[PDB]
């Protein structure tokens, strides 16, 4: 019954603003300090801000001091985080966590956490990929480069679902540009090349993009 639920995450342009909230259940919200902890994809935990049970004492990390404002309405059992002039570096999952005391005391810890809410700060816009054919004993590696697309995700099939066992579709990279690039490879007989036809089927539903790319050596 004791839970924190974060809301308000989304995609935002750099320089934009976002308001995050955190709904508490199962305990007396006012009796406890609540903090925000963020984590950028693939990176470490980073403390963002904290607030006393009454809301009087507010504390902010150096990285966010001016741009962020933490507050709480105890009547609504909700915490808030106002984020302005968002930077790409603010891209992270934002977690709210409940301290074991009313304030940030010596040996206090975060006993309860929420599942978190995702913030993406990107200047990128919806864009379908450019699909390129990747070509070179008993086996041959053939591939499809799905380039410069936004946002996630993309689905890749081979020969319309006929080939799957020897197929490896790699997770996307997020480039500096804010665009994603993904690659799928299939293992096939080297003898069959020039006889057999290998087609990757790329679907990017966000852009309504379907591309069937024939891969030849």
């Amino acid at each position: 019954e004791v839970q924190l639920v974060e809301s308000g995450g989304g995609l935002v342009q750099p320089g934009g603003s976002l308001r995050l909230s955190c709904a508490a259940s199962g305990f007396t919200f006012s009796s406890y300090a609540i903090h925000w902890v963020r984590q950028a994809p693939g990176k470490g935990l980073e403390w963002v801000s904290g607030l006393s049970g009454g809301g009087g004492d507010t504390d902010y990390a150096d990285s966010v001091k001016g741009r962020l404002t933490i507050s709480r309405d105890n009547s609504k059992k909700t915490l808030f985080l106002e984020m302005n002039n968002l930077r790409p570096e603010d891209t992270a999952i934002y977690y709210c966590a409940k301290l074991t005391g009313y304030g940030s005391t010596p040996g206090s810890y975060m006993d309860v956490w929420g599942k978190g809410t995702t913030v993406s700060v990107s200047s990128a816009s919806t864009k379908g990929p450019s699909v390129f054919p990747l070509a070179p004993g008993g086996t041959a590696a053939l591939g499809c480069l799905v380039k410069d697309y936004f946002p996630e995700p993309v689905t890749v099939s081979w020969n319309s679902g006929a080939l799957t066992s020897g197929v490896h579709t790699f997770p996307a990279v997020l480039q500096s540009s804010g665009l994603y690039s993904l690659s799928s490879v299939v293992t096939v007989p080297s003898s069959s090349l020039g006889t057999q036809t290998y087609i990757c089927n790329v679907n990017h539903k966000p852009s309504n993009t379907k591309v069937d790319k024939k891969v030849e050596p």
């Binding site: 903090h35 902890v37 693939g42 470490g44 935990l45 980073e46 403390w47 904290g50 004492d57 504390d59 990390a61 150096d62 977690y95 966590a97 940030s104 010596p106 040996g107 206090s108 810890y109 975060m110 006993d111 956490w113 929420g114 599942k115 978190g116 450019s130 390129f132 054919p133 990747l134 070509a135 590696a141 591939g143 480069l145 380039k147 490896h168 790699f170 997770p171 996307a172 990279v173 997020l174 480039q175 500096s176 690039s181 690659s183 490879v185």
Partner: protein, 209 residues
């Protein structure tokens, strides 16, 4: 910000003792906490006030804060103890997390990566672009470094490398992409994707033809 330094990675065999350290000048004067984060999940406290366990935490987890160094010990480490572990300390009212340690509980023999490197497609070259695609698969444990070379000279620009991700077979995969101009591509003898794992390096090379 006082900085809490942790070793980035620890390997432990099932049943063995895993020692995770956390160092910093203001540590030891202050109390240390330890948070466990399993993949896809929120962090969970396992140790607080240097050596206390929250009621639900198993006894095999324990802590010590000698001098400038705090240590989390996991006795009889289980496969489910595999997680990122972070120390935390309170500087006045500022909370600081440590850099983090990846604890791998060895479930599997070591496996070096299969590396496949593809040159630029002719269609891409026709569009006045050039991407080298280096795909890394079936490596365990799940840590690699990628380096690109032009004619054996390091190339740091135009590189976008993913972080390793766990495959369904519990091995890991990763990708690296090198952006070049058609002109750059055609003006060098060779390009190489060099992947280092557990002290072994694999190199694949492609050339303009």
């Amino acid at each position: 910000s006082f900085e809490l330094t942790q070793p980035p990675s620890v390997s432990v065999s099932p049943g063995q003792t895993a020692s995770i350290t956390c160092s910093g000048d203001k540590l030891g004067d202050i109390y240390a906490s330890w948070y466990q984060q399993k993949p896809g999940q929120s962090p969970v406290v396992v140790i607080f006030q240097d050596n206390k366990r929250p009621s639900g935490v198993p006894e095999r987890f324990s802590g010590s804060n000698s001098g400038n160094t705090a240590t989390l010990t996991i006795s009889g480490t289980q496969a489910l103890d595999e997680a990122d572990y972070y120390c935390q300390a309170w500087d006045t009212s500022t909370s600081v997390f440590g850099t983090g340690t990846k604890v791998t509980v060895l479930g599997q023999p070591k496996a070096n990566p299969t590396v496949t490197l593809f040159p630029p497609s002719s269609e891409e070259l026709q569009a006045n672009k050039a991407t080298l695609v280096c795909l890394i698969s079936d490596f365990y444990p799940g840590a690699v470094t990628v380096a690109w070379k032009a004619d054996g000279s390091p190339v740091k620009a135009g590189v976008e490398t993913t972080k390793p991700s766990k495959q369904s077979n519990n091995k890991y995969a990763a990708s690296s992409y090198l952006s070049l101009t058609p002109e750059q591509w055609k003006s060098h003898r060779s390009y190489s994707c060099q992947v280092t794992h557990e002290g072994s390096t694999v190199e694949k090379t492609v050339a303009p033809t």
